Design a protein around this ligand. Structure first.
Ligand code: 6UT
Ligand code: CL
Lengths: 112, 115
């Protein structure tokens, strides 16, 4: 099923876009939990990390590389945390694979 | 020595014991010694990368492999209600071992924000 992240990719609703290429999109989270909090999502609709295929390996890694490059561009030189949520226990809020990147403050432990 | 001399390098070379879940030529999954959830394990590359901020472009497939192995291990460990994957970078991330590692936590409701 389609999600709000599909609409964001299709430019049907606005988002503050940080980076885009042919296979992913990075944009600021609408409900930020840190001074910097953005998402990196694939344009391919993978609903959750538990159903990702082996052929998706490069794409998932690309999200992380784009994530760390965006983090550097946004000035997160003291570090940051990357998060992927799966399912109910993981607190996944949208069923479209999304990598959170949070920084600009001390991140704590446990991570939720 | 291959893997570096961080604690994770020692674990990769079997010089320090760990409770290993899965191993292949590219990575290792093993339980965290200080778990923050009923199930809490780590997936690390065998190639030493100190932190995600210095990962090279050609490390893409390897990083993605960590996540694929992570989700496969979570399934094998019965985390059917879900889980959270975490990478800590640097001081603000709380990184304490400078060998890239993916945390996988499950077996309870995880909360928001993630720290
Ligand atoms: C202090 N720092 C950390 O541990 C932070 C989390 C953290 C603690 N306090 C905080 C405050 C703010 C933000 C974050 C934190 N985790 P990390 O450094 O990102 O990941 C390294 C993981 O390796 C685990 N580990 C270390 N040694 C061994 C070992 O010999 N054997 C095994 N099996 N595991 C080992 C260790 O328990 C840890 O979860
Ligand atoms: Cl989510």
């Amino acid at each position: 099923g389609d999600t709000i992240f599909g609409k964001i990719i299709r430019k049907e609703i606005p988002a503050k876009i940080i980076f885009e290429d042919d296979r992913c999109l990075a944009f600021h989270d609408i409900s930020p939990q840190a001074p910097t909090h953005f998402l990196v999502i694939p344009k391919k609709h993978i609903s959750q990390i538990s159903v990702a295929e082996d052929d998706d390996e490069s794409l998932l890694g690309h999200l992380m590389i784009v994530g760390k490059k965006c983090a550097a561009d946004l000035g997160l030189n003291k570090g940051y945390r990357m998060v992927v949520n799966e399912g109910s226990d993981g607190g996944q809020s949208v069923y479209h694979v999304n990598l959170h990147v949070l920084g600009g403050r001390q991140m704590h432990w446990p991570p939720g």
